């Protein structure tokens, strides 16, 4: 297993615009569009991003290739923020995917944020990470991913995907 992998049981594949969990418009592999309201606004967007006239509409391979920049974000974001860089220096290879999931799915920014789980994951305190990132938002609202996450952090193995 891979974090192409793993993230593509997570977020699914969908060649039409769509709405997040949140609401808001999505392509791809969990590529969020806009935060906007407007079908309109985000059909602009994809067009923008694809680089062709797409109608809301995009094939796999342009699918794949949205993902390919977005994990590649995902990871430069890690390693150029200096909250999240060195937990992710300091983890295994399982575990530094499990990260980068939670930063691909919220951004740095809200990841940067889960200050006292960070700083358990550094001092590799598995059992109590796992019990503080499960009092979040993040966690209520999307529970059955935030528990595939959390078990990967907690064991170092890839079981929680095994299912799936």
């Given at each position: 297993?891979?974090?192409?992998?793993?993230?593509?049981?997570?977020?699914?594949?969908?060649?039409?615009?769509?709405?997040?969990?949140?609401?808001?418009?999505?392509?791809?592999?969990?590529?969020?569009?806009?935060?906007?309201?407007?079908?309109?606004?985000?059909?602009?967007?994809?067009?923008?991003?694809?680089?062709?006239?797409?109608?809301?509409?995009?094939?796999?391979?342009?699918?794949?290739?949205?993902?390919?920049?977005?994990?590649?974000?995902?990871?430069?974001?890690?390693?150029?923020?200096?909250?999240?860089?060195?937990?992710?220096?300091?983890?295994?290879?399982?575990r530094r995917c499990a990260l980068i999931?939670?930063?691909?799915?919220m951004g740095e920014t809200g990841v940067?944020?889960?200050?006292?789980?960070?700083?358990?994951?550094?001092?590799?305190?598995?059992?109590?990470?796992?019990?503080?990132?499960?009092?979040?938002?993040?966690?209520?609202?999307?529970?059955?991913?935030?528990?595939?996450?959390?078990?990967?952090?907690?064991?170092?193995?890839?079981?929680?995907?095994?299912?799936?």
């Amino acid at each position: 297993m891979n974090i192409f992998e793993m993230l593509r049981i997570d977020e699914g594949l969908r060649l039409k615009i769509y709405k997040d969990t949140e609401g808001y418009y999505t392509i791809g592999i969990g590529h969020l569009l806009t935060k906007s309201p407007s079908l309109n606004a985000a059909k602009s967007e994809l067009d923008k991003a694809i680089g062709r006239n797409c109608n809301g509409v995009i094939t796999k391979d342009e699918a794949e290739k949205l993902f390919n920049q977005d994990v590649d974000a995902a990871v430069r974001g890690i390693l150029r923020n200096a909250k999240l860089k060195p937990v992710y220096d300091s983890l295994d290879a399982v575990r530094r995917c499990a990260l980068i999931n939670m930063v691909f799915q919220m951004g740095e920014t809200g990841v940067a944020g889960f200050t006292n789980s960070l700083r358990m994951l550094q001092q590799k305190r598995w059992d109590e990470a796992a019990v503080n990132l499960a009092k979040s938002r993040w966690y209520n609202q999307t529970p059955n991913r935030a528990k595939r996450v959390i078990t990967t952090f907690r064991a170092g193995i890839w079981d929680a995907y095994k299912n799936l």
